[PDB]
Symmetry: D3
Subunit: 72 residues, 6 copies
């Protein structure tokens, strides 16, 4: 259930801004809006592990740290 709360926060960051975001961008967006300091890795875990909810905008293995969008 913690993971589901974070997934909703990640979607929420991504939907608030209409361009791709790095995992660290998403972390700080969640920090400013929900005032919790989360490890950047925990945002990455969500991003990589829910491949039907999030995807990298760069599919050529060049943009690092990767930029992420919602898969929709």
């Amino acid at each position: 259930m913690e993971t589901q709360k974070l997934i909703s926060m990640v979607k929420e960051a991504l939907e608030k801004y209409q361009y791709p975001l790095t995992a660290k961008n998403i972390k700080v967006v969640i920090q400013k809006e929900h005032n919790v300091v989360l490890p950047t890795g925990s945002i990455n875990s969500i991003l990589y592990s829910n491949s039907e909810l999030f995807e990298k905008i760069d599919k050529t293995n060049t943009i690092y740290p990767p930029l992420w969008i919602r898969k929709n």
Copy 2:
């Protein structure tokens, strides 16, 4: 190596992509097509010191590290 070749490598990097990039993204892009590893802070010097060619896309002091665009 030359101020005026780094301006144009950063500028090329932004122009290759349709979305904002971080300074570190640009670093990795340049390391890819010109095979030179620059410090992340060398790109920031260029980006801030040339406010006519580059601007940040978020102006609410929220997105960090900042996402940069080639200014239209």
Copy 3:
């Protein structure tokens, strides 16, 4: 350079050590014995996209950045 040579470099790196490694550890290991500097995020792509060869050792969402093992 090749997806299937990076899988085996990451996989070699884990196998050289008796304990879990981070993605960045693996990066530095590969930079050591194959003299190529990869972005940290390129290793993560491999680790998550090959969940049959690699798994995280902590499953409590606590260890970040995650520690990875060659799956037994």
Copy 4:
């Protein structure tokens, strides 16, 4: 007005220590004194954008992450 508050905190960190500081040094100095966790990027933004208040002690494009002093 948020930016003005941060500018005052940055000056305050720099004036408390009588040697140059990195943006991350300044971040943690502000954390310990004012107990707010700010993105390192937001300190950088202040530093780079107020070129008449702050300047890099290294003008040879070598020290990275840059070391900063107050321009005075």
Copy 5:
């Protein structure tokens, strides 16, 4: 006395997990358990400065960021 409190927290993180941890792993373990955001450097200081309490599991100067165990 602050340093002694941190030393006890570092030992406590290391003893809670039965594999080596990076300084940033230890930081976030202490964050989750004691809810304080400490600079990663302050964990490193403890680790490097108390060489009879902590040691790197890798003695070949390869694993970076280093992985740490309790010396026992």
Copy 6:
């Protein structure tokens, strides 16, 4: 490559500058004049393991990442 050549590269790096440097600063300095990219953690090993040549300038456990000086 040699313990005793890294001691003298770190030591040269500090001596080139009139102010304290971080371990990462030293890394970038060495990458500049000897064209070898070392992991940040390799410099820390040298700095802490040679407490006769190097010391931190802040002794209040505030400046992180620590700023280092050639000991007078």
